[PDB]
Design an enzyme around this catalytic site. Structure first.
Site, short mmCIF file in Angstrom:
data_model
loop_
_atom_site.label_atom_id
_atom_site.label_comp_id
_atom_site.label_asym_id
_atom_site.label_seq_id
_atom_site.Cartn_x
_atom_site.Cartn_y
_atom_site.Cartn_z
N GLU A 61 0.83 -1.19 0.00
CA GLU A 61 0.00 0.00 0.00
C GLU A 61 0.87 1.25 0.00
O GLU A 61 1.88 1.33 0.71
CB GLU A 61 -0.92 -0.02 1.22
N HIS A 62 0.48 2.22 -0.81
CA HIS A 62 1.22 3.47 -0.93
C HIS A 62 0.58 4.54 -0.06
O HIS A 62 -0.60 4.86 -0.22
CB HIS A 62 1.25 3.93 -2.38
N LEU A 63 1.38 5.10 0.84
CA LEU A 63 1.04 6.28 1.62
C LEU A 63 1.89 7.47 1.17
O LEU A 63 3.06 7.31 0.83
CB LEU A 63 1.25 6.02 3.11
N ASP A 100 13.82 -2.06 13.85
CA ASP A 100 14.76 -1.14 13.22
C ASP A 100 14.15 0.25 13.20
O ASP A 100 13.88 0.80 12.14
CB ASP A 100 15.10 -1.58 11.78
#
Length: 302
Positions: free
Chosen positions: A91-93, A211
């Site tokens: 998914e692109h934010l 991380d």
């Protein structure tokens, strides 16, 4: 099929037109594609252990997203590439750098480390009564901190888990690649002193991003976003060790976090034991350049 045609097959779009630049401004690698079902981000890696590295990230993303506490990008697909490796669709934010939402995140992280503990307490009431606590440290699968296939085998005691499956992991490849004398000598002396740094302390396994440095954390119109997990169940103070190291975090972030999990006695010495893992791991990834900090740290502990 190559990368774009394979992405079209698995995402069921005919569009896949691209936009953005290198990692959309925040992620180290990746490109954003507009498809028929909205926008996605695609990370490419052509090493052999790419899929596993990416399969570790999906487990991490899957496990943080399932706690409802933090917003991470939703995994979508992992496609094997013909020229070696794998691509990871997610998914692109749209992402800004973490500024205003640094207060919100410190308490999202704080809740995330206390989530598994609220779960144990539910099971206590459930047991006495006339969604599953993890009583061990580790992870159900191999998550990677870099390109080092790590071992997350469940151990019951945290100093045990960390020493053998984190520190020894790295100082072994440091022995093979660098044959460093000051490293093995110092490690043999350190390994015995580790149990003395966790006395007077009860540790409840906490689910960690794994991380969380300033470059794996962003913000949104909605709130804070974290990404690039190397997840496992551990000690919440470990999560902060890499966060401090490359300090792009506002004091907002720790003012919130330590309101919920305040610094316990022995914080500042265990900080060194955790920054020690990250220095070793960076020695193995980036060169002898991290030898001066790694050894100066085991020197410091003893």
């Amino acid at each position: 099929g190559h990368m774009e045609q394979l992405l079209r097959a698995e995402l069921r779009t005919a569009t896949l037109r691209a936009f953005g630049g290198p990692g959309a401004g925040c992620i180290s690698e990746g490109r954003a594609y507009d498809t028929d079902a909205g926008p996605v981000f695609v990370k490419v890696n052509r090493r052999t252990q790419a899929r596993q590295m990416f399969e570790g990230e999906v487990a991490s993303l899957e496990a943080l997203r399932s706690t409802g506490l933090v917003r991470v990008p939703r995994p979508m697909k992992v496609i094997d590439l013909p020229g070696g490796g794998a691509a990871f669709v997610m998914e692109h934010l749209k992402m800004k750098s973490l500024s205003s939402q640094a207060s919100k995140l410190g308490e999202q992280m704080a809740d995330l480390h206390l989530y598994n503990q609220k779960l144990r307490e539910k099971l206590k009431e459930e047991e006495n009564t006339v969604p599953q606590y993890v009583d061990k440290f580790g992870f159900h699968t191999v998550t990677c901190c870099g390109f080092i296939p790590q071992v997350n085998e469940w151990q019951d005691d945290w100093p045990t888990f960390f020493a053998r499956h984190r520190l020894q992991a790295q100082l072994d490849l440091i022995e093979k690649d660098y044959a460093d004398r000051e490293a093995r000598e110092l490690w043999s002396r350190l390994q015995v002193k580790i149990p003395d740094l966790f006395c007077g302390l009860e540790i409840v396994p906490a689910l960690l991003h794994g991380d969380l440095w300033s470059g794996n954390v962003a913000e949104d119109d909605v709130g804070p976003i974290i990404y690039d997990p190397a997840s496992f169940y551990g000690h919440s103070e470990f999560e902060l060790a890499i966060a401090l190291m490359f300090g792009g975090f506002p004091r907002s972030f720790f003012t919130a976090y330590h309101r919920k999990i305040p610094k316990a006695p022995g914080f500042d010495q265990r900080l060194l034991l955790y920054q020690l893992f990250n220095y070793l791991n960076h020695w193995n990834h980036f060169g002898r350049e991290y030898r001066s900090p790694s050894l100066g740290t085991m020197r410091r502990l003893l």
